[PDB]
Amino acid sequence: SHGTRKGMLIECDPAMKQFLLYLDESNALGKKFIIQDIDDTHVFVIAELVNVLQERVGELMDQNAFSLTQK
């Protein structure tokens, strides 16, 4: 084998799939997560997609007095 990449293959309806493509193109999560587009219902993404999403949602929380000294 020449090219190989560890990751996560996702299978989902045509709607959700287009949404992932939209999220990836717009960097709505702060960073790209799509390694390769495949089918209209399949996409190969980074293994740590959940962490990325968990990290993005954190910034969405309400700002407080410690928002800048801790983050």
From Swiss-Prot:
A GO CC annotation given for this chain: nucleoplasm
Keywords: Cytoplasm, Disease variant, DNA damage, DNA repair, Ichthyosis, Nucleus, Phosphoprotein, Transcription, Transcription regulation
Pfam families: Tfb5 (PF06331)
Database matches in SMART domains: Tbf5
InterPro entries cross-referenced by the UniProt entry: TFB5-like_sf, TFIIH_TTDA/Tfb5
Residues with PTM Phosphothreonine: T69
Record function comment: Component of the general transcription and DNA repair factor IIH (TFIIH) core complex, which is involved in general and transcription-coupled nucleotide excision repair (NER) of damaged DNA and, when complexed to CAK, in RNA transcription by RNA polymerase II. In NER, TFIIH acts by opening DNA around the lesion to allow the excision of the damaged oligonucleotide and its replacement by a new DNA fragment. In transcription, TFIIH has an essential role in transcription initiation.
Family statement: Belongs to the TFB5 family.
Recorded disease: Trichothiodystrophy 3, photosensitive: A form of trichothiodystrophy, an autosomal recessive disease characterized by sulfur-deficient brittle hair and multisystem variable abnormalities. The spectrum of clinical features varies from mild disease with only hair involvement to severe disease with cutaneous, neurologic and profound developmental defects. Ichthyosis, intellectual and developmental disabilities, decreased fertility, abnormal characteristics at birth, ocular abnormalities, short stature, and infections are common manifestations.
Name of the protein in question: General transcription factor IIH subunit 5
